[PDB]
Design an enzyme around this catalytic site. Structure first.
Site, PDB file in Angstrom:
ATOM      1  N   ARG A 126      -3.095  -5.366   0.324  1.00 47.84           N
ATOM      2  CA  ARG A 126      -2.913  -6.810   0.276  1.00 47.84           C
ATOM      3  C   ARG A 126      -4.110  -7.713  -0.057  1.00 47.84           C
ATOM      4  NH1 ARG A 126       0.347  -7.872   5.579  1.00 47.84           N
ATOM      5  NH2 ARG A 126      -0.807  -6.005   6.293  1.00 47.84           N
ATOM      6  N   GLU A 145      -2.053   8.909  -1.676  1.00 50.93           N
ATOM      7  CA  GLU A 145      -0.614   8.839  -1.887  1.00 50.93           C
ATOM      8  C   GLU A 145      -0.192  10.051  -2.723  1.00 50.93           C
ATOM      9  OE1 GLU A 145       1.064   4.759  -2.798  1.00 50.93           O
ATOM     10  OE2 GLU A 145      -1.069   4.357  -3.162  1.00 50.93           O
ATOM     11  N   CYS A 177       1.597  -2.538   3.757  1.00 48.23           N
ATOM     12  CA  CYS A 177       0.753  -2.431   2.553  1.00 48.23           C
ATOM     13  C   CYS A 177      -0.725  -2.657   2.834  1.00 48.23           C
ATOM     14  CB  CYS A 177       1.208  -3.437   1.497  1.00 48.23           C
ATOM     15  SG  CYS A 177       0.237  -3.404  -0.024  1.00 48.23           S
ATOM     16  N   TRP A 187      -1.578  -0.224  -8.259  1.00 45.34           N
ATOM     17  CA  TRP A 187      -2.297   0.971  -8.695  1.00 45.34           C
ATOM     18  C   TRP A 187      -2.388   1.864  -7.444  1.00 45.34           C
ATOM     19  CZ3 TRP A 187      -4.974  -3.809  -9.525  1.00 45.34           C
ATOM     20  CH2 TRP A 187      -5.895  -4.166  -8.521  1.00 45.34           C
TER      21      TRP A 187
HETATM   22  C1  HEM Z   1      -2.939  -3.151  -5.988  1.00 45.08           C
HETATM   23  C2  HEM Z   1      -2.651  -1.903  -5.529  1.00 45.08           C
HETATM   24  C3  HEM Z   1      -2.008  -1.692  -4.313  1.00 45.08           C
HETATM   25  C4  HEM Z   1      -2.372  -0.696  -3.473  1.00 45.08           C
HETATM   26  C5  HEM Z   1      -3.642   0.173  -3.632  1.00 45.08           C
HETATM   27  C6  HEM Z   1      -1.344  -0.631  -2.452  1.00 45.08           C
HETATM   28  C7  HEM Z   1      -1.276   0.415  -1.524  1.00 45.08           C
HETATM   29  C8  HEM Z   1      -0.086   0.743  -0.814  1.00 45.08           C
HETATM   30  C9  HEM Z   1       0.051   1.934  -0.042  1.00 45.08           C
HETATM   31  C10 HEM Z   1      -1.036   2.963   0.202  1.00 45.08           C
HETATM   32  C11 HEM Z   1       1.235   1.797   0.573  1.00 45.08           C
HETATM   33  C12 HEM Z   1       1.951   2.839   1.446  1.00 45.08           C
HETATM   34  C13 HEM Z   1       2.769   3.704   0.461  1.00 45.08           C
HETATM   35  C14 HEM Z   1       3.540   4.805   1.165  1.00 45.08           C
HETATM   36  O1  HEM Z   1       2.985   5.456   2.078  1.00 45.08           O
HETATM   37  O2  HEM Z   1       4.708   5.026   0.800  1.00 45.08           O
HETATM   38  C15 HEM Z   1       1.846   0.569   0.149  1.00 45.08           C
HETATM   39  C16 HEM Z   1       3.078   0.077   0.622  1.00 45.08           C
HETATM   40  C17 HEM Z   1       3.623  -1.157   0.258  1.00 45.08           C
HETATM   41  N1  HEM Z   1       3.081  -2.025  -0.659  1.00 45.08           N
HETATM   42 FE1  HEM Z   1       1.287  -1.904  -1.543  1.00 45.08          FE
HETATM   43  N2  HEM Z   1      -0.314  -1.544  -2.687  1.00 45.08           N
HETATM   44  C18 HEM Z   1      -0.738  -2.252  -3.795  1.00 45.08           C
HETATM   45  C19 HEM Z   1       0.047  -3.224  -4.452  1.00 45.08           C
HETATM   46  C20 HEM Z   1       1.270  -3.708  -4.021  1.00 45.08           C
HETATM   47  C21 HEM Z   1       2.034  -4.709  -4.720  1.00 45.08           C
HETATM   48  C22 HEM Z   1       1.678  -5.404  -6.053  1.00 45.08           C
HETATM   49  C23 HEM Z   1       3.065  -5.011  -3.914  1.00 45.08           C
HETATM   50  C24 HEM Z   1       4.043  -6.014  -4.113  1.00 45.08           C
HETATM   51  C25 HEM Z   1       3.932  -7.106  -4.935  1.00 45.08           C
HETATM   52  C26 HEM Z   1       2.995  -4.111  -2.787  1.00 45.08           C
HETATM   53  C27 HEM Z   1       3.982  -3.980  -1.784  1.00 45.08           C
HETATM   54  C28 HEM Z   1       4.021  -3.013  -0.785  1.00 45.08           C
HETATM   55  C29 HEM Z   1       5.164  -2.818   0.093  1.00 45.08           C
HETATM   56  C30 HEM Z   1       6.470  -3.683   0.136  1.00 45.08           C
HETATM   57  C31 HEM Z   1       4.885  -1.659   0.747  1.00 45.08           C
HETATM   58  C32 HEM Z   1       5.755  -0.876   1.753  1.00 45.08           C
HETATM   59  C33 HEM Z   1       6.926  -0.240   1.020  1.00 45.08           C
HETATM   60  C34 HEM Z   1       7.741   0.678   1.904  1.00 45.08           C
HETATM   61  O3  HEM Z   1       7.895   0.364   3.105  1.00 45.08           O
HETATM   62  O4  HEM Z   1       8.237   1.709   1.397  1.00 45.08           O
HETATM   63  N3  HEM Z   1       1.880  -3.294  -2.861  1.00 45.08           N
HETATM   64  N4  HEM Z   1       1.016  -0.092  -0.713  1.00 45.08           N
HETATM   65  C1  LIG Z   2       3.361  -1.261  -5.408  1.00 46.31           C
HETATM   66  C2  LIG Z   2       2.804   0.032  -4.787  1.00 46.31           C
HETATM   67  C3  LIG Z   2       1.378   0.335  -4.886  1.00 46.31           C
HETATM   68  C4  LIG Z   2       0.897   1.573  -4.281  1.00 46.31           C
HETATM   69  N1  LIG Z   2      -0.387   1.913  -4.325  1.00 46.31           N
HETATM   70  N2  LIG Z   2       1.818   2.411  -3.641  1.00 46.31           N
HETATM   71  C5  LIG Z   2       3.183   2.142  -3.536  1.00 46.31           C
HETATM   72  C6  LIG Z   2       4.091   3.158  -2.797  1.00 46.31           C
HETATM   73  C7  LIG Z   2       4.849   4.177  -3.764  1.00 46.31           C
HETATM   74  C8  LIG Z   2       3.858   5.152  -4.478  1.00 46.31           C
HETATM   75  N3  LIG Z   2       3.475   6.124  -3.418  1.00 46.31           N
HETATM   76  C9  LIG Z   2       4.621   6.247  -2.436  1.00 46.31           C
HETATM   77  C10 LIG Z   2       5.688   5.194  -2.950  1.00 46.31           C
HETATM   78  N4  LIG Z   2       6.356   4.558  -1.775  1.00 46.31           N
HETATM   79  C11 LIG Z   2       7.481   5.270  -1.137  1.00 46.31           C
HETATM   80  C12 LIG Z   2       7.664   4.766   0.278  1.00 46.31           C
HETATM   81  N5  LIG Z   2       8.814   5.486   0.868  1.00 46.31           N
HETATM   82  C13 LIG Z   2       9.010   5.051   2.268  1.00 46.31           C
HETATM   83  C14 LIG Z   2      10.454   5.362   2.664  1.00 46.31           C
HETATM   84  C15 LIG Z   2      11.417   4.314   2.701  1.00 46.31           C
HETATM   85  C16 LIG Z   2      12.769   4.602   3.052  1.00 46.31           C
HETATM   86  C17 LIG Z   2      13.156   5.943   3.366  1.00 46.31           C
HETATM   87 CL1  LIG Z   2      14.854   6.304   3.781  1.00 46.31          CL
HETATM   88  C18 LIG Z   2      12.178   6.995   3.333  1.00 46.31           C
HETATM   89  C19 LIG Z   2      10.828   6.702   2.981  1.00 46.31           C
HETATM   90  C20 LIG Z   2       3.732   0.933  -4.108  1.00 46.31           C
END
Ligand code: HEM
Ligand SMILES: Cc1cc(N)nc(C[C@H]2CNC[C@H]2NCCNCc2ccc(Cl)cc2)c1
Ligand code: HEM
Ligand SMILES: Cc1cc(N)nc(C[C@H]2CNC[C@H]2NCCNCc2ccc(Cl)cc2)c1
Ligand SMILES: C[C@H](O)[C@H](O)[C@H]1CNc2nc(N)[nH]c(=O)c2N1
Ligand SMILES: C[C@H](O)[C@H](O)[C@H]1CNc2nc(N)[nH]c(=O)c2N1
Ligand SMILES: [Zn+2]
Lengths: 409, 411
Positions: free
Chosen positions: B111, B285, B108, B280
């Site tokens: 953070r 994305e 993420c 947000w």
């Molecule tokens: C405030 C806005 C936030 C922004 C701009 C942000 C941005 C992102 C982005 C760009 C990614 C990668 C998404 C992807 O490529 O699928 C991501 C992944 C992640 N974020 Fe954040 N995030 C935010 C808030 C949060 C919040 C509130 C949480 C948890 C309380 C969080 C937990 C995570 C986790 C667990 C991942 C990885 C999920 C995965 O592996 O699929 N994020 N975030």
């Molecule tokens: C709290 C939060 C805040 C923001 N800005 N962005 C997100 C991420 C959420 C919106 N855009 C892509 C979505 N994540 C999908 C990740 N897939 C990985 C993945 C995981 C597992 C498999 Cl099998 C395939 C792919 C969450």
């Protein structure tokens, strides 16, 4: 044991076994991944196992694994090492070794070309003028009037570590860097230091923005000598945009030959500290990194102005818009002047094909995702969606300390 | 031991000691790096140490390590474990736990906002309808009419693994995907299989290009149930370009609330299988991945045509040109409708400062470079030039298997 890598855009899954034959470390552990870290004399006891490993794969490659020829050679090198505390490679071994270090370069996206490499055996070299001669011949052969051809020139191997052949330049062809009073930097900031080590050695820097550096050659361990590459042998490309005339006014140009000269080639345990190698550019290396990196020519702001972009807010993505144009120019210029170049879309598509060939012909393909994915438009290239396994195989190309930080003058 | 990371753009070097508290595995070894691999019930025995480590971390954070309160809590928890094989977290510990799973999420880039998280405690929830109510409340609070606020809702923890609470949707809000008999896909290809499950379960699919999927909620291990999120609660943004008037005619729009709902939240050994969280969006994305991935909406060609770019050869970089415009359009729209969003330059720049602060006040910041670097313009963002260390700290957010693959249907 039998690892699998998946491509998330096409669901293709490949199985990797080649990694089992890996021998060198990665820097990573089960507790920490060092995947994004840039940089994570031998004994007879150390050397023979290495030579053996190499020979077995070589003989295996020519379908004569465990043949008298194989057995014989092993013994010959074996006797030679015990006797000479080292050995010499057969020409065929040298060529095979070099092709494979390229084949094993996990950070190279252009490996589909690995088997088409011209090898120049410069092991009979003895002086800096000699090295200069070989290098000019390499440059001319590789340039081939714009129709670039991959090549490597291999100087004498390491002995007592006190008679090392080294090319002091990082690349055969680069631009000098001068630190002005304006605190600013004239030319390429990346070369400032080297540029001074030349002056400190005699070079008469023309103090320009694009001054082709002089070669600084070291032979048999002696002090290094300077040489200016015949201007006629250095193919350069004036950078002009196919729509923005004012572009040419930026006064930008780049050399057509990408040629790494500071690495060390290791084959069957032997070390080659001077082995300059070259291919042809992928557009982004120049347009994105050489031109736009802030620590390099860092030209975005200027190109931005010339385009009249709203540089007030980052969210207008002016940096991005200008990045694209700068890169369209590069490909355009090189293509116009007919100098070989490949765009990141074609190169990455080629690499995907190469991986597939490698998985089904060799059991896999070491690859460093962090380096393979281009520095722009990452996810619209196929390698972005491709899982990769990184491990180190030999023969290989390795980094080595800059000579000026080890030379006992 | 000590480990250093260097930024090759600024030469700033950082030292990491935090990795010493890393417990889980990475997937890598001294012989192979699995850094680009997407995906590389407990016993009282194993649970005791997990709660302790967590509680120690928690009491240290409030400056009460070794206090009587700390010691009593440990005895109380261990007694509870030996007694019930599990234990309940105090509200404070849950909040601290959730905030930290986010803080430790190495993938993420957002953070810097970690300590600012609204935690909704839904551990008293018992049914699917109860889940639906909690989720609507979270969506409305987080949405806040476009002025987005980060939030997480936490349903009851896993017990015997046969009574799990699960949100079947991968995200609270997403568009349906439909497979046509001619082989083409209508809507979002990524959700075809889930969309089929919804239809099978009784959903009446409007079969459009942007239909908000219904929620499929599973409570206490029972079969999931369908619910439609009140439309007035789903904020959406029509996409238009600031200079290209034909852009609005592409008929594109996207939802404003990114909310992951399929991950598992681990705190002191407890497992919270249903823990939707939202923030947000970062522009890319949507503009890069949801819109331009070949396996998602894949709009690059249609956009390139309109701009009349030379698409005869890739070396014209028509794909790159259209990509920039699409991403400009996403940011422009969101900002115009006053819906929170951050561009990738601003977001990566913030992450670097966050990272530096973390190294200084915490001794480190686990980060996955492969995910932190934006899917476009990689090297013109500071993260590209930043060396990073990836390791796993708990509390944490983990992947879990899709429920339709493990659920025992009851009827
Ligand atoms: C405030 C806005 C936030 C922004 C701009 C942000 C941005 C992102 C982005 C760009 C990614 C990668 C998404 C992807 O490529 O699928 C991501 C992944 C992640 N974020 Fe954040 N995030 C935010 C808030 C949060 C919040 C509130 C949480 C948890 C309380 C969080 C937990 C995570 C986790 C667990 C991942 C990885 C999920 C995965 O592996 O699929 N994020 N975030
Ligand atoms: C709290 C939060 C805040 C923001 N800005 N962005 C997100 C991420 C959420 C919106 N855009 C892509 C979505 N994540 C999908 C990740 N897939 C990985 C993945 C995981 C597992 C498999 Cl099998 C395939 C792919 C969450
Ligand atoms: C034929 C055209 C070739 C193309 C288009 C190509 C492209 C690339 C690219 C894009 C990189 C990344 C460069 C950087 O980011 O600094 C690279 C790295 C590298 N290439 Fe290739 N390459 C080609 C030829 C060669 C040849 C002939 C060899 C050697 C025999 C080779 C060996 C390497 C090595 C070892 C690296 C990584 C070096 C380092 O770590 O700095 N390449 N190549
Ligand atoms: C044969 C060939 C063909 C092509 N197309 N490209 C190359 C790559 C070469 C031209 N562009 C970047 C140069 N590499 C710089 C490596 N920096 C790593 C590095 C090493 C050590 C330090 Cl201290 C910093 C950075 C070689
Ligand atoms: C810190 C990070 O490893 C570093 O910036 C890497 C990222 N990927 C790269 N990839 C290539 N091809 N070339 C580079 O110089 C880099 N730099
Ligand atoms: C195979 C590769 O790991 C995969 O495509 C990753 C790369 N980096 C990513 N980075 C982010 N933020 N999100 C992703 O989905 C991915 N996909
Ligand atoms: Zn690793």
């Amino acid at each position: 044991r039998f690892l699998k890598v998946k491509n998330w855009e096409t669901d293709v899954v490949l199985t990797d076994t080649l990694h089992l034959k890996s021998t060198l470390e990665t820097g990573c552990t089960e507790h920490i991944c060092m995947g994004s870290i840039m940089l994570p004399v031998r004994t007879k006891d150390q050397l023979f196992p290495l030579a053996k490993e190499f020979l077995d794969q070589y003989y295996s490659s020519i379908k004569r694994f465990g043949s008298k020829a194989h057995m014989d050679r092993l013994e010959e090198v074996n006797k030679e090492i015990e006797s000479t505390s080292t050995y010499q490679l057969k020409d065929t071994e040298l060529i095979y070794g070099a092709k494979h270090a390229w084949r094993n370069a996990s950070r190279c996206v252009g490996r589909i070309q690995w088997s088409k490499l011209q090898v120049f055996d410069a092991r009979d070299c003895t002086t800096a003028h000699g090295m200069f001669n070989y290098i000019c011949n390499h440059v001319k052969y590789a340039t081939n009037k714009g129709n670039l051809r991959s090549a490597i020139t291999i100087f004498p191997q390491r002995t007592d570590g006190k008679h090392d052949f080294r090319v002091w330049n990082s690349q055969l062809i680069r631009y000098a860097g001068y630190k002005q009073p304006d605190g600013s930097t004239l030319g390429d900031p990346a070369n400032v230091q080297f540029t001074e080590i030349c002056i400190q050695q005699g070079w008469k820097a023309p103090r320009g923005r694009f001054d082709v550096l002089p070669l600084l050659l070291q032979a048999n361990g002696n002090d290094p000598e300077l040489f200016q590459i015949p201007p006629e042998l250095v193919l350069e490309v004036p950078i002009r945009h196919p729509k923005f005339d004012w572009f040419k006014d930026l006064g930008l140009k780049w050399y057509g030959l990408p040629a790494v000269s500071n690495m060390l080639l290791e084959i069957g345990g032997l070390e080659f500290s001077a082995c300059p190698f070259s291919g042809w550019y992928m557009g982004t290396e120049i347009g994105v990194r050489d031109y736009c990196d802030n620590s390099r020519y860092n030209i975005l702001e200027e190109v931005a102005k010339k385009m009249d972009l709203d540089m007030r807010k980052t969210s207008s993505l002016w940096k991005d818009q200008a990045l694209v144009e700068i890169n369209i120019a590069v490909l355009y210029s090189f293509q116009s002047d007919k100098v070989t170049i490949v765009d990141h879309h074609s190169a990455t598509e080629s690499f995907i094909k190469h991986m597939e060939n490698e998985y089904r012909c060799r059991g896999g393909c070491p690859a460093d995702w962090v380096w393979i994915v281009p520095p722009m438009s990452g996810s619209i290239t196929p390698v972005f969606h491709q899982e990769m396994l990184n491990y180190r195989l030999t023969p290989s190309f390795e980094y080595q300390p800059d000579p000026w930080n080890t030379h006992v003058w």
